[model samples]
Target chain A: MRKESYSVYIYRVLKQVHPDTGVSSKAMSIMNSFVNDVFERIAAEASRLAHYNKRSTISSREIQTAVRLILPGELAKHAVSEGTKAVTKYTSVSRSARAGLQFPVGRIHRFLKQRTTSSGRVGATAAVYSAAILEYLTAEVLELAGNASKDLKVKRITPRHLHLAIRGDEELDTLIKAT
Target chain B: FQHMGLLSTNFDMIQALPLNVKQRVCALKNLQMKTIQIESDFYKRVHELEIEFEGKFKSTFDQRKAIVAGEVEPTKEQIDTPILEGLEGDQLAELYKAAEADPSAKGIKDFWLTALRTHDLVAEAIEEHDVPILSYLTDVTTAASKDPAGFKIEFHFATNPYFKNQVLTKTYLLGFDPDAEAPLQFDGPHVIRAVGDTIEWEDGKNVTKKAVKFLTKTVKADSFFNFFEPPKSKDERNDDEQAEEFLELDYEMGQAIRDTIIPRAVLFYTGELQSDD
Candidate 1:
């Protein structure tokens, strides 16, 4: 339904690639066409993957496979990564907030799609996804912070205490990887 | 000697993969190698044929030039008699008669140009056609382009009895340098005399445009170039269940073809539907 997104994205990417050169309207439409073409191909391929796996819903693996096919290799590896991070950044929090879960459902769904054998059933559900993000974020944070509070003999826990605890912990590196 | 050594060493790089992967790669290499061989084989075949064609046309051209310059002997039988057997033979005999009558009954090139425009010329010109040799000289370049450049097949109808004869239907492969002077880049290709129908799937035997005897008409365009344009959705009112199922099946067929999911692709993908009687 949207006409502006991909064309705008293509324009941004083109400018980023070559800022000095003034691209003509023709060039913009050409690049936009290419973007649309690639998307169409990927979408079709993704559906094919779904059919191959005999699934009604196109899985994340299928999407990844479609991207790989359209891309033909690590052609635009960064583009896929950028798309991924953007989706994770917004989708994870916004979607997960509505459900009983703590973790980002959209993020998990996206990651699951990226994963090799993400035959995700319940983990894909919004409530479950949100819960998973919820668990990942708070389950360890509060526990670790409380432990830090006890160590300091303080009744009230502060943000600084939790930050320091998380900073020093081995899981900080893993959390970085997770996000 | 150095080239041989380089190849032996580079040959072993794929050995690092696992046994199964290594075997798969080897199979892929063999398959890919077929295309390379076909390319080289065609280039060489065309190259040799070019020399032969040059020899024939050069002699023919020189003799005509001498005649035009008015410097020939009075060989009665050769000048008077013309080979006029078939339809083409008859047309050529008439042209020869005219050239004899007039100093300039249109030069050889102009005559050829005029004849080229009409199908009558085509009909009259089978004598020059080396159908057997032309077909033998042929190699449909589909197989060579399987995994990587899965694009259009450049049918090198080099000896095409159509056109000036040298139809390299391979646009872009010849490498164009536009913006250069117009006629300077032109390669004055010759007249028709070529084809290559059968792809030699197995050695010693050539299968000519083989077909899968389908249960109905042709099924999926799953063949090649099937995707890129998805089949349009159908009418709302569906009567026959068979017709209905064919549409959906045809859709999958195109998808499967485009997906490149078919592990060993050799046969054509019709994606065409064969309806129930």
Candidate 2:
């Protein structure tokens, strides 16, 4: 079940998060798997929403709503707002002008804004952490549905494979249960 | 005032435009259609040219294979052809005769295998198990497909114990994206997908599968021969975006074989043409 992971990119982010930090390979693998799990949950919920609404295309709006459904309590609020801001910034950027595989750091910086209760200041470096995680999550969600569709023997990706992929994994299903 | 009126309501963008603007847009659309038609003509001509030259290429390859396989000895004219005015050919007669008489020079052993291994991407596709099987590969050739506008790569194998088929064929289909909203955006013909013929393996001689776990269980392992069995789509026009990526990679491998490995085989075998450099 192994696919490509964002361990190297995650490690680079980790170094930025803590300049003196060194991560073990096991720790890296766990972090990567955790990110993958969350990504799958979001993708599953989004696909389910698309099916329920009778739409073939899954847009950012579905992801925005899916985040609300999956992330509980205060985290949901923070996530939804960040995701919205991210999408807004994306729409503002011109398609032809946009550069590279990632969203601009400034947009991600705004998205990763913290609560006043936190002591540490949110800097440009800290935003790269969230950007890296979100970017990896985005790629994984799309790829998950893709492979799922192939396994389901469908030409195009549908909600069935997306949910099937989630339900096939016992651990993943349990984590996002009752949503 | 006319433009402002058009934007005032939720009417269809094209329908709401002024009559003159509408006429201009339609004219532009007509031009786009003509360009696409012209491009299609260009591709057809290109395919024809490729087919015309393929014969010349094949005859040349046949001579090369004949020399390599010891079916025909090199002619004196071939060995003594003058490339420069001062650099004469009389010296190579003794050299060629001596090399021809050498015991080990009867036929090149593992010629295709060595050449394939020289390419980085192609080499990566070959697993440890595939080496012995690929040693039987005699020649590889490509033909431009005419019906659906694509190409086919044919691998010629000698009488090998691994497979029954002497010639394994892989076909790639190319077309402009049919379902796209704006047809003008399609720059040229693209490889929609590839289809490969099945390789009939001998009894318990499949290189693509290996015995695993206490030498009892057998499972599929990565092998270069899998190039002959691409993923199948239920529909001819594949809409699977995920499968699209895989097919894209598959197409690239095919290109490397047809364009690089087959054309400059001698250079590849001699390690003169590295993929990076």
Candidate 3:
């Protein structure tokens, strides 16, 4: 199975960071791999943090603190600051285009408390981070499924195509195997 | 009193004014009231005009419905012909001959279904199970509601195996804030509440529900048909926050169906129009 990467979005981000410069296909491939690796690394650390805290679900707080644990001293602080700003903007707008779809922060908080032996806590920032990760996964899966549908020369995406989309990505496959 | 103080930027300055100077300020309040009175009248006129136009469009909408349902046949003049250029006489004649030979097809099929699927918001609401039922949808029409100053949207469906209802309706009631003190911030009619019709589903054919592992156990599935289900009022709901969210969602969908989907359906079907954001 071919790897389904965010080539278009990655290219766009690359252009913004390094304007007027083109990238070789090989370099592009490397960048895509680096992105996937970084995301996987952070997610793994966040999950570990949740596990250590005896929590069932990972929240933004775990991810925020996970960066501090993984990254170097100053770089970790900078990343955390950026993460906080992004979360603030995310919650403020809550996707202005698709309004009325608020993140279920209360539900997530309740779920965390219910699953843990001790009283679990969720910050407002953590709620937004959880929503952001959920949004990212949804976008990734849909993009992969759309590509798979095109590859099969089909107009509509069926369950088989969705399965193939997940199967094509090792990380996605491992994450969604049960579901 | 605090709310009133925040309404004017010069509240402190006005309060510090002498009694003699304040007499004219009281007249300014009366002037502000007059302006609001005129603005309210303007809104009333706008509603009247909207009702007039909606009434005028009813006949046209009915005709569209009939044509799609195969109840009415359109004439050559009624059908808008495409403009073709630089075609030979023989080519034109052959095209006309072919058209005449294959005239068995009626109006567009899956017109509303295809259109609905093209829009992202509406498409997300529809599940695989709901597609077949939606295929029976013929037309969507909206009428201005005079009783409560809002609008009613109707979805007309052909006789289908899933349901007995020929028409499903959702009415949104609107109202203006009557307790405004001054400086009308009214941005036109706001949706006060909405009520949708009860979909008469054939036994065991309800798309909104799914059977669990056990025969008797069933759970509500995410389906477009659930849009017809009424949400509990703020007072009725234990959690008012969640209730408000539900109401907001219902209104948003109602507005999308009425304003966007019904008007630019063809554009959506052709993939030319996208739900922005």
Best by DockQ: 3
Residue-level lDDT of model 3, residues B80-116, one tens digit each, is 4532434554755565565453467677788888888
- Candidate 1 chain B lowest-lDDT run of ten: B268-277
How far residue B79's Cα lies from its native spot in candidate 2, in Å, is 3.0
Per prediction, fnat is: 0.00, 0.00, 0.15
Clashes of each: 32, 0, 0
The reply for model 1, stretches above 4 Å from the true place, is A1-6, A15-20, A53-55, A93-179, B1-277
Q: Per-residue lDDT of A38-89 in model 2, one digit per residue for the tens? A: 6555555555655554333345565567666766555456555555555454
Give the Cα-based TM-score of candidate 1 against the true structure: 0.20
Question: How big is the positional error of residue B10 in model 3, measured in Å on the Cα after superposition?
Answer: 11
lDDT per residue, candidate 1, B132-185, as tens digits? 323322222222121221222222233322223232222111211221233222
> What shift in Å separates residue A179 of candidate 3 from its native position after superposition?
18
lDDT of 3 by residue, A1-179 (tens): 11224344444433443343334444445434544454455555655666667544465778777666554455455556655655767555224212122223333233233223322444545545533443344445556665776687765445666677768886666544322
The residue-level lDDT of candidate 3 at B157 comes to 89
Lowest lDDT 10-mer window, candidate 3 chain A? Answer: A93-102
